Amino acid sequence: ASMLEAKFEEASLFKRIIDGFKDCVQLVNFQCKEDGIIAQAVDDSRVLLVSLEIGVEAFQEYRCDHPVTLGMDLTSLSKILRCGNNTDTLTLIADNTPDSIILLFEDTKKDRIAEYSLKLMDIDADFLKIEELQYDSTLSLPSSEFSKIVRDLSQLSDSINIMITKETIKFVADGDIGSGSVIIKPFVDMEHPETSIKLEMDQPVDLTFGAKYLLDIIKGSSLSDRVGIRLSSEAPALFQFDLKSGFLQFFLAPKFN
Amino acid sequence: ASMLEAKFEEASLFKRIIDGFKDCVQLVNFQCKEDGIIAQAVDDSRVLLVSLEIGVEAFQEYRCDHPVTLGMDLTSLSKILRCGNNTDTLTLIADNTPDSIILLFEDTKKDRIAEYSLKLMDIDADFLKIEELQYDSTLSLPSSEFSKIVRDLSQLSDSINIMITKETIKFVADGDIGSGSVIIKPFVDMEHPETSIKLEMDQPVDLTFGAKYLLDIIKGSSLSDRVGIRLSSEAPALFQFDLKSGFLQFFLAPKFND
Amino acid sequence: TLSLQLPWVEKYRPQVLSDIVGNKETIDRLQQIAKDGNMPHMIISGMPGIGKTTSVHCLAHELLGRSYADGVLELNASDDRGIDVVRNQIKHFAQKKLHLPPGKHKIVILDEADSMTAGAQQALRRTMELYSNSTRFAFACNQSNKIIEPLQSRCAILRYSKLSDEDVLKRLLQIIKLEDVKYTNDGLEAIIFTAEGDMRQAINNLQSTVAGHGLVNADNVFKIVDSPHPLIVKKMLLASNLEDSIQILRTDLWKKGYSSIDIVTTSFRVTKNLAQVKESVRLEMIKEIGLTHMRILEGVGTYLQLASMLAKIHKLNN
Amino acid sequence: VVREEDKLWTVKYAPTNLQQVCGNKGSVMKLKNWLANWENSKKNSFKHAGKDGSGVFRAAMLYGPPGIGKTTAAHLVAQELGYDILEQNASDVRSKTLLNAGVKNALDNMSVVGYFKHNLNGKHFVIIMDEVDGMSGGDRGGVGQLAQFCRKTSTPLILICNERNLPKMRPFDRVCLDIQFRRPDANSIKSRLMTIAIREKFKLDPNVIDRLIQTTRGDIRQVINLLSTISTTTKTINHENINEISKAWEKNIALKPFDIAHKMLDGQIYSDIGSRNFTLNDKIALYFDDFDFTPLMIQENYLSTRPSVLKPGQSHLEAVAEAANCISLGDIVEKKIRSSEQLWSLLPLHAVLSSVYPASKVAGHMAGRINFTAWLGQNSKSAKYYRLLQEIHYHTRLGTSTDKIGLRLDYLPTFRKRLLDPFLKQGADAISSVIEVMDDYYLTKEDWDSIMEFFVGPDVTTAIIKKIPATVKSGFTRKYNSMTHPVAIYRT
Amino acid sequence: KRSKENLPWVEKYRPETLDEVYGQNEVITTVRKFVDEGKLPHLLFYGPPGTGKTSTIVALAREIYGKNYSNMVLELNASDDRGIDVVRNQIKDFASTRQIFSKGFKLIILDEADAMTNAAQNALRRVIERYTKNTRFCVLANYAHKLTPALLSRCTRFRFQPLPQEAIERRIANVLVHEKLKLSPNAEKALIELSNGDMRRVLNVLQSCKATLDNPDEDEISDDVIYECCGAPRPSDLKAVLKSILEDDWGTAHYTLNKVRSAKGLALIDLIEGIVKILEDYELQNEETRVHLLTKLADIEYSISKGGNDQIQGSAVIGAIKASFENET
DNA sequence: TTTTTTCGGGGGGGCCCCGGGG
DNA sequence: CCCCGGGGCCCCCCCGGC
Ligand SMILES: Nc1ncnc2c1ncn2[C@@H]1O[C@H](COP(=O)(O)OP(=O)(O)OP(O)(O)=S)[C@@H](O)[C@H]1O
Ligand SMILES: Nc1ncnc2c1ncn2[C@@H]1O[C@H](COP(=O)(O)OP(=O)(O)OP(O)(O)=S)[C@@H](O)[C@H]1O
Ligand SMILES: Nc1ncnc2c1ncn2[C@@H]1O[C@H](COP(=O)(O)OP(=O)(O)OP(O)(O)=S)[C@@H](O)[C@H]1O
Ligand SMILES: [Mg+2]
Ligand SMILES: [Mg+2]
Ligand SMILES: [Mg+2]
Secondary structure, eight states: OOSEEEEESSHHHHHHHHHHTTTTOSEEEEEEOSSEEEEEEEOTTSSOEEEEEEETTTEEEEEESSOEEEEEEHHHHHHHHHTSOSSSEEEEEEOSSOSEEEEEEEOSSSOOEEEEEEEOBOOOOOOOOOOOOOOSEEEEEEHHHHHHHHHHHHTTOSEEEEEEETTEEEEEEEOSSOEEEEEEOOBOOSSOGGGOBEEEESSOEEEEEEHHHHHHHHTTTTSOSEEEEEEOSSSOEEEEEEOSSEEEEEEEOOBOO | OOSEEEEESOHHHHHHHHHTTTTTOSEEEEEEOSSBEEEEEEOTTSOEEEEEOOBGGGEEEEEESSOEEEEEEHHHHHHHHTSSOTTSEEEEEEOSSOSEEEEEEEETTTTEEEOOEEEOOOOOOOOOOOOOOOOSEEEEEEHHHHHHHHHHHHHHOSEEEEEEETTEEEEEEEOSSEEEEEEEOOBOOSSSTTSOBEEEESSOEEEEEEHHHHHHHTGGGGGOSEEEEEEOTTSOEEEEEEOSSSEEEEEEOOBOOO | OOOOOOOHHHHTOOOSGGGOOSOHHHHHHHHHHHHHOOOOOEEEEOOSSSSHHHHHHHHHHHHHGGGHHHHEEEEOTTSOOOHHHIIIIIHHHHHBOOOOOTTOOEEEEEETGGGSOHHHHHHTSTHHHHTTTTEEEEEEESOGGGSOHHHHTTSEEEEOOOOOHHHHHHHHHHHHHHHTOOBOHHHHHHHHHHHTTOHHHHHHHHHHHHHHHSSBOHHHHHHHSOOOHHHHHHHHHTOSSHHHHHHHIIIIIITTTOOHHHHHHHHHHHHHTOTTSOHHHHHHHHHHHHHHHHHHHTTOOOHHHHHHHHHHHHHHHO | OOOGGGSOHHHHTOOOSGGGSOSOHHHHHHHHHHHHTHHHHHHTTTOSOOSSSOSSOOEEEEEOSSSSSHHHHHHHHHHHHTOEEEEEOTTSOOOHHHHHHTGGGGTTBOOHHHHHHOOOSTTSEEEEEEOSTTOOOSSSSOHHHHHHHHHSOSSOEEEEESOOOSGGGGGGSSSSBOOBOOOOOHHHHHHHHHHHHHHHTOEEOTTTHHHHHHHTTSOHHHHHHHHHHHTTTOOEEOTTSHHHHHHHSOOOOOOOHHHHHHHHTOSSTTSTTHHHHSOHHHHHHHHHHTTTTHHHHHHHHSSSEEESOOOTTOOHHHHHHHHHHHHHHHHHHHHHHSSTTOOGGGHHHHIIIIIIHHHHHHOEEESSOOOOOSHHHHHHHHHHHHHHHHHHHHHSTTTOOSOHHHIIIIIHHHHHHHHTHHHHHTOGGGHHHHHHHHHHTTOOHHHHHHHHTSOOGGGOOHHHHHHSOHHHHHHHHHHHHHSOOOOSOOOO | OOOGGGSOHHHHTOOOSGGGOOSOHHHHHHHHHHHHHTOOOOEEEEOOTTSSHHHHHHHHHHHHSOTTHHHHEEEEOTTSOOOHHHIIIIIHHHHHBOOSSSSSOEEEEEETGGGSOHHHHHHHHHHHHHTTTTEEEEEEESOSTTSOHHHHHTSEEEEOOOOOHHHHHHHHHHHHHHHTOOBOHHHHHHHHHHHTTOHHHHHHHHHHHHHHSSSTTTOOBOHHHHHHHHTOOOHHHHHHHHHHHHHSOHHHHHHHHHHHHHHHTOOHHHHHHHHHHHHHHOOOSOHHHHHHHHHHHHHHHHHHHTOOOHHHHHHHHHHHHHHHHGGGO
């Protein structure tokens, strides 16, 4: 327990973060640097990419000397995490050339300590450098409204087309039960600023995505409170959900023209 | 209806007793005396032994002229016992040289009477005294905590190792995805005495048990609030749940280590 | 007495590749692989009691060592090996990260692989190709035709051959020296003859003879162990006079407790492998034996039917 | 990090460029031409044809024997022309439910990895469905779903399999381009084997490659594994040791129905010299290669050979008669085997009675081609006609006193004269009489057709019915439909 | 289940200890020595019906253990499902787990293993081999062709021969002493002859004979009682039938056969079997005679097994015998 | 150069619904 | 009071010798 010693202030945070993107990807690469933890994972469909950053601020006590890449299977990680207690201290331990990681569930009210070990998987997947992209349109709206709209449109069509233009956001779902369109516009309310809808558009754009991927993306909306949608000409939409220290970003690729 | 007439406080009691070990053994043999009912059942694998010792004080009335042995099938007994309500009184009736046991359900408030007779099975049982070995270690812990520990460690692997040492209890489980360990120490409390871990140790011990049998030995946690585990080296391990009147004991044979 | 002692077949199981007798080329090659590394995917085929599982285990042990616990996944017929097992547990083991010495890899030992469904074998194809840099696969089978050709193309074939008399004699003498057994050369010859090249059977027969009567001689060896009944059937079917064949069937098979079904099946097999007799005569004898077998399978099994079968065979061979 | 010395020779000395693949050059070029012009076909909506007729098929179906370079060729073509590969293998669940929730949602989606990696097709998808034949599912395996994808895919879908001629893959009959990869010849593989020999420091004479290749049935992977294993202790591969190596590593593939029939009906394996090389055990095992089709093939192909194993004075007719007698005995044994008793222990005997013995009497040289069993289709036809006869019989049970056999043999000849002859002789005016007769026996129009389909010999009605004037038949049908008719069985 | 006096003689006289098993001296001595020194291997008792395999293994288990062997052994038979799931789970847990009651090794008795499927036998291989340190397997069989070669190679084979005459006489004497019965020497000889090495047949026939006697206290079981209760032919009857068939005309032979059969309702199959046994001793000068006799009599036996016309069958027997012996000139 | 019958066992996919948690 | 995990049947698909 020398190289990597990290301690969550609350164990529930790690469980929620993992559950946020548990159904999106199968295997993950947690690269623990000296500055925090960064993870990149591509689903089996090879169409949705997931980035995750956790900073030192969220961590009560973090000590990592050398950078270590840990390949993990999210199913086993979820199994071990479920074996812990929500009102508990979770500690991640990694040692020299870790073939496995140690998850330590430790509490102060009682003296019960549970030390689980998870075997790491040799993940052969190069880190896809996520070059900064200046998306044409930026839409930020409360997670509740995004979830409501997408869930309502889920029963309509398997593919949803999103068009962004002047103070206007259209979500159209044309499936086997008909065609349904939802139109939203920006608004600023001092009573509920957190629910305010903000749109920043330079050139209107239109892109069609898959309903299932959007549903799986929103499934993790409980972690954050708003959405950070960014849309460009031919680039995946950046569904960014910001957490305490760091973020969780989805890069849902678009449908063919 | 001469030898045995035993009416329970409520049918729910006998139901709960039966559900505690109906998924472990198939054929049971009760031996009803003037002191109560005692049953011993051995699993098909010959790895788990269930012993029930219901007491006389668990019945509104209990009459038994002579010691009478009844061999029965747990599936059929449970199926018949599921044919009653939770607000009725269940009485067991047995006659001379029993060929069947009669289960009578009565509801005075609704004036409801239901009859059910189950044919007994000729089992030449040799009920074996549970010789209380000088167990190397004994402990008592809340049943919910034991259930949580076993259910967590079952997923990791199919075996659970219990190590008893100087004020320390180690539940370890090594599997395929990874390994897990839970360490608990004797904790005494006075604000809520119901929950506490007590340990009386003479020699240190270490025993491995199958997860499948432990997962069924914990279904009796609904029958009590605390569980007592007695462990001895290369000897059967005792898991006891104390009922309102009697007790339910599971004897589990430790696995071979070669 | 309630404390048994380990049988010699287990107490004297070879723990090194140099202690395995027979198949000198294959054993030497496995030793060279163990000393060098780069173990290839292999399928070891042969008859029972020759040392396939022993060789596989010895190779894995000598190759890994302290990493044997975490670098070996042994699955056999006693363990579930369905499609789900292949697609989850084996895949996880192959993907699992383990730091091994420079020239060592993880090992998956699928013992008795001939009892695996075609679907599981098909699902076992790509896992061996996309994870060959970390894990290697060793199969041990009796029938090599039960493994699908795509998998056979992915592994090196090691067809172990029947053990000879010299190898069995060498191993038996070594065990005798290590146990100080009083023996006669005739006893060892009888043990080898009755073992039919199966080392397990030879060792078991020797242990039984020593533990029952002591001195290992022809008389004591044959008192417990009976001569192979296939040879008796061959002798009965190759007799000149019907009287001699009937006498062999009577005093050597019927009164020894051998069932009629066993006798007819053994006769069918022996006639199938009776190279001395011409193919046509063998086919007619097989027809008669099949008629007798069909008669017996319907409940009419008696010495009279076997005598009639022998008479018909003699008429065919006249 | 992986030291090359610890890598398998198959992956170490593996093809790296599409040209490095030996043999089957035409197949590789055909695949490259098909996949390169995929976008052009998309622009044409896959309606126009091409020079090689590859512009209409939307998917590729690479196939061939094992260990020839199918998956390697597919991956090399996908990587060379420029595409992103989404490969699915037998280790992944390819059921219908997973397919709908899996690859289906990616057939018409962009490549996130393709864009974030950096060619117009570099960001496009190439779905390779390897080991199609290995999918164990008849109703829940989603093979028809794979065919649907091939029909409705927005990206090049390449399917790879080892054996095309199987019923399971009948859905892919004509919805895909059938590219054939064959066993590579020794000429091309000699260069690779010599290169590996020079690299790995062991001797391999030029005369040994052809024999080694024949040992493995042209499986380059198997030959490389052979070389790697033999080089462990013996560094010399010369003519002095070819026999032992080839005998120890001889490949044993199960012959297929046609090959089994051809081998079994040969007079060289039954000779006093050939019987030693090919023993009775070999023939009995050959029977078990396909124990459901071998007896039928033997029974179908035992009358089309010139024998060479006839005894002095025996003629062909006597030999075929003896073979037929033993075939009948084997049929009786087969009836015994597949019964309530489940007597499978008799299977070896059946092999001798139905396949080996009858062939041994008419063995020789084929006087034609090995024809497939005709009994299966005849049995299907018999079942169809029997069901039709049963329906007709139970439609007329209320006006007749007989069984179905009696109806076929006795009543139908007279019913024809009362139902069809009036049309031939009278014409349209007879429509009323035929309608009446069909009404007296609760006979439907479909029943009329089925009855007319039963007659054989000089009573065949196909040409006679086809010759009837169209007006009479049209009036008959219209009058029947315009009239109300009774019902025999009132299915409630 | 009142007492042992209300049980069939086959079960009332089941050997309790290993000293009550007769006719298997070699196997009994070997297994007793193995139990003494503690060198019990994996055993395979192969033998015909009613030779003392199940009794021998039960006695061995009771000798190793006490009277609580029932809970300390895993005995599985054809009446219980023994599929691959059973082998994988129940047998594996029993072999890999310690004894609840005692602190000794464990015994698994797979009686009637010939009825097990090939998959279960294949799965049993490594289960047997791995837990050999604390577990031993015993397999009881009547037919060996149903056992996989691997299982046969993994077990030490002991063959239970058909019970010789001497052991049968000793056990008959024991039963007579216990039941207070008298058996004539010729009755004993007939009983052993009809036994065919099976003690169950002997016990059942002896019980039937005791039933036949008016007062079993003083009356003696003569051969007449044996033939009456078994309804079997009398040796004099078989000899007379053969003599009439071989030395008289067709009418005389037919009349003699019909009279002998109608005297006590003798079955044709029993007469054919007895005549075959008698002719076995005959020294024929021509092989063709014996060949024809055997083939035709086997055909007649097969025809009788399916019923048919009995008079035609008897006439066929007579004609076949006459035609076969016509070649002895 | 193509394509069938029956019990029993085993495997593998599909729901269904009780129980338990929130 | 409502949702999710995971035991239990139900249905179908394929083998069967040495
Ligand atoms: N070549 C051998 N040299 C020495 N002992 C052998 C040899 N072969 C078999 N034995 C002995 O017999 C015992 C069993 O050998 P096994 O390895 O189990 O044979 P096997 O070929 O694997 O059996 P099968 O084919 O799975 S039925 C070993 O523990 C050895 O004691
Ligand atoms: N034409 C070839 N030239 C050189 N090597 C080949 C060739 N074909 C196969 N190999 C070698 O065998 C190895 C595996 O070939 P694959 O393409 O994977 O087999 P395949 O043709 O797809 O047949 P299956 O369905 O996998 S059995 C390659 O990595 C090569 O090393
Ligand atoms: N050696 C024997 N000595 C005395 N009685 C015997 C002997 N063998 C068989 N019997 C008698 O026949 C009865 C049956 O004996 P068993 O050994 O149990 O039969 P079994 O050999 O198991 O039959 P199979 O082989 O399964 S058909 C015993 O109860 C005895 O009464
Ligand atoms: Mg083995
Ligand atoms: Mg391939
Ligand atoms: Mg028995």
